[PDB]
Write a protein that binds this ligand. Structure first.
Ligand SMILES: [Zn+2]
Ligand SMILES: [Zn+2]
Lengths: 88, 107, 101, 116
């Protein structure tokens, strides 16, 4: 139906509207196409339950209540592979 | 051994509520929970103050003093609702005569 | 934020700014007067809204309600409401001044 | 519709219909005294059989304050546009045939009543 995930870096926050099945670095390519975040610039801190390594949205931790129009899923991010872990 | 128990008022919020409509209707369901509005004028606070009670207007006007001069017209809304058989005399704002009438009645 | 007219960035003079879809910000009455100023054709692509004194959670909720309402505009669903907290809604009434929705 | 009573002005009493053939018109002639009065409306007796469609004059608006009456938010007022209304039924013997909801606006000083 929809997807709603808070891509929150502190001072810079990205929004999501897509369907219920998507690749997780597809979203990174989407934000790369405008905000210019190359694939070095994502780390993907964990969601409520076990952020996915299999790289598809229809998996564990992701349900239909997370993608709620009423309510988000707020979590911090990091724009690095392994160099620094940056908050604020 | 749980007892099933529930009631329902039969019938027959399907409404396009935008930002200002949602804000005013949230305030129209929780009027009494306001401490101090800050610096909000009267025009944007028009509807919820109409659906309000004079004890709550008293609390707001003693918390949000600078608003009293723009609330007085609404007090006539209370006055013709409660003291309809009366007219103020010269140099009488509706708020202070309303509170005078309330204090006189309770005395 | 860039040249493409589908993402619009907006800042409340604080840290956590938010960038929302322009196609999900269509119902704004002030996007036709601020982003669409004296003229179209690359005034809208700037996406620099340097507004002030809106708390972070407040403008987060108002842009969520923007995309919420625009997706729910003319949509199959007609029932739903939105849960604005009673305290922040006070300053969100300030948003009722500016966003013109 | 229904035509009201006519009252004599001299002896403070009821008038009665009568047809004076001199002008061939209708006069309301009291029969305690000699007072006479020509009639604005020719209707003397009138009856309603299935003309009970208007239950709204029997409804007084005060029933908006009844704590036992049910309140709804899905039927807004036409006059003032208030969300709250009270809904009930017409409770006469001449309304056993219907279970139509009659609505009264809950807000003060409005008093608007409607159906459906
Ligand atoms: Zn007489
Ligand atoms: Zn009404």
């Amino acid at each position: 139906m929809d997807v709603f995930l808070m891509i929150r870096r502190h001072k810079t926050t990205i929004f999501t509207d897509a369907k219920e099945s998507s690749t997780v670095f597809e979203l990174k390519r989407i934000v790369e196409g405008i905000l210019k975040r190359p694939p070095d610039e994502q780390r993907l801190y964990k969601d409520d339950q076990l952020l996915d390594d299999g790289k598809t949205l229809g998996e564990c931790g992701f349900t239909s209540q997370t993608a709620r129009p009423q309510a988000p899923a707020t979590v911090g991010l990091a724009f690095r592979a392994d160099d620094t872990f940056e908050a604020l | 051994g749980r007892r099933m128990n529930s009631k329902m008022q039969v019938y027959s919020l399907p409404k396009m509520m935008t930002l200002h409509q949602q804000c005013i209707r949230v305030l129209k369901n929780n009027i009494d929970s306001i401490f101090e509005v800050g610096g909000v004028p009267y025009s944007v606070l028009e509807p919820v103050l109409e659906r309000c009670t004079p004890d709550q207007l008293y609390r707001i006007e003693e918390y949000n003093h600078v608003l009293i001069e723009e609330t007085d017209q609404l007090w006539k809304v209370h006055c013709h609702r409660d003291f309809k058989e009366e007219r103020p005399e010269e140099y009488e704002s509706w708020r202070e005569m309303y509170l005078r009438l309330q204090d006189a009645r309770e005395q | 934020e860039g040249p493409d007219a589908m993402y619009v960035k907006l800042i409340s003079s604080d840290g956590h700014e938010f960038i929302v879809k322009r196609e999900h910000a269509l119902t704004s009455g002030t996007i036709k007067a601020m982003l669409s100023g004296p003229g179209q054709f690359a005034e809208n692509e700037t996406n620099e809204v340097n507004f002030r004194e809106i708390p972070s959670h407040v403008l987060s909720k108002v842009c969520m309600y923007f995309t919420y309402k625009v997706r729910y505009t003319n949509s199959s669903t007609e029932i739903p409401e939105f849960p604005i907290a009673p305290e922040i809604a006070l300053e969100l009434l300030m948003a009722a001044n500016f966003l013109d929705c | 519709g229904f035509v009201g009573i006519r009252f004599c002005q001299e002896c403070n009493n009821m008038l009665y219909p009568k047809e004076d053939k001199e002008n061939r018109i209708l006069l309301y002639a009291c029969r305690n005294c000699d007072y006479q009065q020509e009639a604005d409306n020719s209707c003397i007796y009138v009856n309603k059989i299935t003309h009970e469609v208007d239950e709204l004059t029997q409804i007084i608006a005060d029933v908006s304050q009844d704590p036992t009456l049910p309140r709804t938010e899905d039927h807004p007022c036409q006059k003032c546009g208030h969300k709250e209304a009270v809904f009930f039924q017409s409770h006469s013997a001449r309304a056993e045939d219907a279970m139509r909801l009659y609505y009264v606006c809950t807000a003060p000083h409005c008093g608007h009543r409607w159906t459906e």
